[PDB]
Design an enzyme around this catalytic site. Structure first.
Site, PDB file in Angstrom:
ATOM      1  N   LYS B 202       0.826  -1.208   0.000  1.00  0.00           N
ATOM      2  CA  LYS B 202       0.000   0.000   0.000  1.00  0.00           C
ATOM      3  C   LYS B 202       0.860   1.257   0.000  1.00  0.00           C
ATOM      4  CE  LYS B 202      -3.431   2.823   1.602  1.00  0.00           C
ATOM      5  NZ  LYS B 202      -4.797   2.973   1.029  1.00  0.00           N
ATOM      6  N   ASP B 334     -12.555   1.080   5.250  1.00  0.00           N
ATOM      7  CA  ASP B 334     -11.556   1.903   5.925  1.00  0.00           C
ATOM      8  C   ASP B 334     -11.897   2.011   7.418  1.00  0.00           C
ATOM      9  OD1 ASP B 334      -9.420   3.579   6.563  1.00  0.00           O
ATOM     10  OD2 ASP B 334      -9.726   4.888   4.821  1.00  0.00           O
TER      11      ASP B 334
END
Lengths: 435, 436, 433, 146
Positions: B202, B334
């Site tokens: 990421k 998230d």
């Protein structure tokens, strides 16, 4: 309005004192409001009670006074794993262990090396469940002491656990702390208090295995030990000392330690001293029984004889302390959720305690293991904390009953029900904390 | 010993990608799905050998969330200071509850994009705790002054903790964030996450949504650094996921070879075609926008609140547009493990404009695309695929909000093992105390 | 099922006591089961013995109580080499040296600066062969003490050998350890114990050469020395002190050191003190004889060395005459000319060959205090460290300088040298298969 | 994270010991393993072995035979790093030997200019012709598999 719970018990074992037949106990919020016979329940509680339970046997929640919150990976077989295991892995494992402890009726644990302080924050904020944790933070050791990882080079170990060279990476917050000299040791103690430690643990003699350090020899100087005790005392903590040989035992006593662990070479002189000065005896017989059951499987013949010799002394020492009336508490020296119940078996079958005295050692006497940090707990008494467990069978007739967690049917901690009929895994009124 | 065979009869079976079946059945043999089809067509060998049988109204694959963060933070600091200040032992303990809760909700796979997923996965895989399959990025990679930096702390403290220079004791290179500047440093940044067992990489490729410190409209990292990051991940069969809001960030991430984009707030027609062309996954994370919209700009200055609303509208258009254009989509929230992940399915329907069936496709069949070549055959009720299967009381095609009640998820299988069901304890079937 | 060996000896020298003619010794496993005359061998051993040997002379294995396990490269001529030599090079060299020691009948060594602890692991696991090694680990020195490398700058030396700043790179495991102050010195001792040190060595005066530090001046404070001794004592170690001048000698004695090395300016007052308190005297005369045999030095520095050489001789002779307990040490690398020290004990010290042997055998374990097993003597119950000789050393002490004269070597009852025995001892296998 | 890394220890301990940054006392740059990331670091990595007297250079160019941490099928180092490593060795008249299992590793090592390959577990017809063409030595180490 106060939350009132009434529990009727066929047999009630208060922790220190004669058991009662056909008794009852009242919980009001966090505290025990009444204890006595069923007939004498004050009427106000009969009117106001939110719920009532009826159990065969009732007693205080169990303590173990020698736990280590390691949560190690199963890669290295020595203390290398404390260093190598990432603490996030550790905390996850300890979460299971804490759950398992509470399901077994253990409502208080004394952690003597590891992440008890850090894991306690997840218990106290409701995210997970577990016993009351009284942690030492890191065990304090000298260089080349029982806390050192001899198989690693010294710079790696002191870089990780020393009290010099502050740096990023959770410095001063591991399972072990290495300090040498009066100056360093002051910081060593303070670093554990910083984490929230409610006790201090020192290595005051060698390890039970005779390979690197020697159990017969003392560790730390008397000068360092005295400072360590003074530093703990100033914040109302007592010190617990790992001790085998008499050199270690006497140095720890002289310094002002109030709890001794193992105490393998305790003799008449030691028992009187401990009585005189109010020093707690925590035998951890489970640890010896484990290696005895191995039969010297990979060990050299002379090293196996040495372990047996130590095992015999440890037995005499324990039996002698019990006979002499030294105050005793039970500790296993295992991970959270480990086989702590066995220590009660060994208290009876090895030590020579009555089942009733063994229960006293795991309940009423156990808060002595944290000195002035203990609340009124470990007993079924008015005004004490409502840490209460219920059993299906009478442990006074068979002390092995505690080795079957199904036999512990109800568990209360601070008046809150964490195990019982109809109660989910995370306790009564549990909600998802992340929602 | 025998292969373990389980037969499940389902009033309605939702395969993940394809038309649902009525009065169906599914066979599990050990870890994989052995048969899927109508009740009448169960091969006789399984009828003879089956150890147990279940009968449920609705059956479907286990749910993925493709944007989780394994933080487990203490509640003390309100910004990213808490990632640094929280002792990881505290974090792991918290994440253990969260992982339990995830599995009880029918979430059998999680993609962790910043935190201790790798380290916590070791406790799942050794049986100590339970949870979803965790595919972790390890640390999110950020530039200095990027969306991963903690601006409120001085720089030497942050790079001492999360930089890739100055190896030292104290679990160096194993936090929730990794700061690297330049091609040389970014090579080590990627390798450090692979070292932990990361199954995805990421990067922060634009500023944060809030726009206090960095700006969401501006790109982050150089194209040179991004390309190296993607090359490094590719060599070990990982894809890169990029945090992106503004188009500058979106285009740079695409050019570099990133195969998954997060938020994608300023995606337009040009972006949708590019993502289709190159097979790039769209993970919207609408939940994150809905949270701050529900606040109404309470702690915020009037102009900063207007900026957040403007971004919220673009994000909605971008999401709806990508759905209409036929970009491949997966769902991510998230949030922390055990968070409100089910809401993302609601937003996929009520905001994005997906059918309940397409929304389920995005949380099941499409979701393993989020980890590229690291995915097994999973996310679908299909022969040969992994037996990650959940059972429901009610038909989610009639109400997508059904997933928001964990009691409605009655049975959970992960790798053919039952972790939730009638008579099954909190730690799954045949659970033992690992510490005895 | 015990392994029994009978050895018949024309002459048996027990180590402490009158030699016996036509004697015999029985080994059972690791210990000595019987010693006395051939006629009195208990019959049970005659029945069970696995093998018998017949040798002219039998005696205990020899100790040297002052060795240094350096294994240095030959490149630098001062202590820079200790620092610069990679320890892998050192260990390889020490392996040869340990082999050579054992072939010469030396079954125990006291290492007082170097890698004895680390090399002992390769002896004890069977990979190589050698004497029992009792190591100090690093010698402890003050900054600007006899252990310091004056030719290098100070940050380089304390970076390598100091007890601050833990770091990667085998920190705290070299041939020298520099510590200043009571706090640091506690760690200095502990760091050697950590390695497995069975003795502690301090520099308590300057070096024999008077260039940087002075042999006449003491080193470390009395405060540091006392702590050092306390730290060693707590783990059942004694401290050995490098001492030349009387200032150093007296400070070391006061602190509780139980072994002194060189002891060059020992006088009547010192000899009585050492007797009173049971302190061992290890002269290392070989070291003085080497530089005496040389005669590049400035005239005034050479006179100073001769003056020190004479004092050292008087001190040694005086201690022998006064009945101070003595042991032999050479101050050399493993496999070095240790046998010469026996010659010097007789020809310089004035010992009888029998007393010299007592100093290298029976008295020598005193050099490690409570860490010694019952050894150094041919006596029932003691460890079977036994050597056999072709000739009588009581008639010529130089006999030990020919390793061919040592025909049989036993260590812990195991035969490491003897007729038909290979280089790595009886029943040796390639450890890497 | 290559075949030379000690995955069971934390990364700071391993790179403190074997990395080519942070010179320090304690025989720095003289162990059994050397960890280097990037073209800049790999130049020093090669030079540090030559310094010791190395008469060959060895790289890990794929994962370890055990598939626990790294994967033998995947290549290790970038082609950029490998080429520099080979150039650095060549300048002092050394060749490079490459630990290789999977074909990805084998081909990357060959392309870079390595002249000796170890194990070579997934070598096929294409690999054998390449090795003949360019004069590359094959060292199988079958004992390790047996």
């Amino acid at each position: 309005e106060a939350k009132v719970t009434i529990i009727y018990a066929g047999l009630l074992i208060p922790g220190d004192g004669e058991p009662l037949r056909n008794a009852a106990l009242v919980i009001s919020d966090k505290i025990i409001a009444f204890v006595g016979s069923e007939a004498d329940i004050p009427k106000k509680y009969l009117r106001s009670t939110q719920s009532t339970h009826r159990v065969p046997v009732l007693m205080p929640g169990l303590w173990d006074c020698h736990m280590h919150f390691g949560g190690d990976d199963d890669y290295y077989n020595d203390y290398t794993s404390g260093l190598a295991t990432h603490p996030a892995s550790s905390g996850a494992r300890l979460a299971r262990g804490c759950w398992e402890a509470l399901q077994n009726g253990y409502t208080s644990y004394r952690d003597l090396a590891g992440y008890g302080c850090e894991v306690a924050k997840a218990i106290n904020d409701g995210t997970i469940v577990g016993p009351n944790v009284y942690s030492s933070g890191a065990a304090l050791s000298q260089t080349a002491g029982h806390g050192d990882i001899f198989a690693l080079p010294a710079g790696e170990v002191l870089g990780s656990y020393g009290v010099m060279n502050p740096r990023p990476g959770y410095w001063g917050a591991g399972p072990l702390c290495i300090a040498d000299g009066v100056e360093e040791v002051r910081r060593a103690v303070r670093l554990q208090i910083r984490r929230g430690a409610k006790v201090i643990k020192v290595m005051a003699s060698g390890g039970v295995m005779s390979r690197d350090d020697n159990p017969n020899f003392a560790q730390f100087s008397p000068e360092e030990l005295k400072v360590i005790v003074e530093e703990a005392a100033r914040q109302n903590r007592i010190v617990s000392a790992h001790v085998h040989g008499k050199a270690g035992i006497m140095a720890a006593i002289k310094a002002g330690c109030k709890s001794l662990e193992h105490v393998s070479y305790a003799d008449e002189e030691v028992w009187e001293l401990m009585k005189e000065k109010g020093i707690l005896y925590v035998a951890t017989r489970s640890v010896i029984e484990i290696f005895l059951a191995s039969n010297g499987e990979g060990l050299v013949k002379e090293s196996w004889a040495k372990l047996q010799a130590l095992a015999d002394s440890h037995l005499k020492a324990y039996q002698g302390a019990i006979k002499a009336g030294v105050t005793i508490a039970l500790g296993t020296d295992t991970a959270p959720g480990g086989p702590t119940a066995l220590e009660l078996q060994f208290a009876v079958e090895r030590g020579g305690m009555t089942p009733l005295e063994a229960i006293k050692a795991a309940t009423a006497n156990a808060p002595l293991s944290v000195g002035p940090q203990a609340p009124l707990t470990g007993q079924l008494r008015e005004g004490y904390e409502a840490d209460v467990i219920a059993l299906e069978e009478n442990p006074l007739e068979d002390i092995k009953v505690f080795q079957e967690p199904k036999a512990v049917t109800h568990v209360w901690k601070g008046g809150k029900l964490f195990k019982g009929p109809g109660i989910g895994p995370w306790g009564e009124d549990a909600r998802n904390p992340f929602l």
